[PDB]
Design a protein around this ligand. Structure first.
Ligand code: G9V
Length: 256
């Protein structure tokens, strides 16, 4: 018995429910780029319900968040293309609302499957690694003076052109959300996102901007603290690696 099939089937059942909701049809299939010739030129990350279903069946989504993140892309894309208040964006939001409803109704089962699919989400070493990361963000990085601009995602309302320039946005709240979801099994991925903050400030504000001087201070204090914790983190990453390999040993052995 394989929990990924059960999970994928739950998501597929939700896709079916959203397709059956009223007025959702313009999103059921990929945009026909041969009729609407500029579509993939405005939206960079196309998404639709057929490709989403195809990804669910290829088992690419091991948890609520990857599926929901791809689902939420549809709404952001309509908001971008149709406008933030277009009825279509409102209809894509109506499907997301039903989705949030189903995830809420079935949340205990979903938790059980998500943990069976990926046991690291219960590994005392993964949780501790994530806890340490969270403290670096809150106790060191968010304490940099005048670091408030990086605490939350940019609101396009206040910086109207930001996301036309920055295609890989990042912020400290998003990283914390990622930590809470245990996205990071090691310092490499964590630092990829951390360094992305500094790179983005350089691009949008310029190398000599005060925003970038603050971002340099944020990254520097992140590295200083990682260096201070090197030996414990190396041990945690090692135990995480071993748990991850055993979660294959005991995962695919069952598919037979
Ligand atoms: C991911 C980090 C990008 C860093 N960043 C931020 C801003 C910035 C963001 C927001 C904003 O959207 N806010 C507030 C914080 O909470 C969410 C809502 C508001 C702002 C801002 N500057 C003045 N105000 C009033 C800005 C402006 C010019 N360059 C930048 C810049 O590089």
């Amino acid at each position: 018995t394989d929990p990924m099939v059960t999970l994928s089937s739950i998501l597929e059942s939700i896709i079916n429910d959203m397709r059956d909701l009223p007025n959702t049809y313009p999103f059921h299939t990929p945009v026909n780029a041969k009729v609407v010739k500029d579509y993939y030129k405005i939206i960079t990350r196309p998404m639709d319900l057929q490709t989403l279903r195809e990804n669910v069946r290829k088992r690419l989504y091991p948890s609520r968040e990857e599926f929901r993140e791809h689902l939420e892309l549809i709404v952001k894309n309509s908001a971008t293309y149709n406008g933030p208040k277009h009825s279509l964006t409102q209809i894509s939001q109506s499907m997301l609302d039903l989705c949030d409803e189903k995830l809420k109704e079935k949340e205990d089962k979903l938790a059980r499957l998500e943990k069976a699919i990926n046991p690291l989400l219960d590994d005392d070493d993964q949780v501790a690694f994530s806890f340490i990361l969270d403290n670096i963000v809150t106790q060191k990085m968010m304490a940099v003076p005048d670091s408030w601009p990086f605490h939350h995602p940019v609101n396009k309302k206040f910086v109207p052109d930001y996301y036309k320039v920055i295609v890989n946005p990042m912020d400290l709240e998003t990283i914390r959300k990622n930590i809470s979801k245990h996205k990071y099994q090691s310092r490499e991925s964590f630092l990829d996102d951390v360094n992305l903050i500094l790179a983005n400030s350089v691009k949008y504000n310029g190398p000599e901007s005060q925003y970038t001087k603050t971002a340099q201070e944020i990254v520097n204090v992140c590295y200083q603290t990682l260096t201070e914790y090197d030996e414990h983190l190396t041990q945690l990453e090692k135990d995480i690696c071993t748990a991850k390999e055993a979660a294959l040993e005991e995962a695919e052995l069952e598919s037979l």
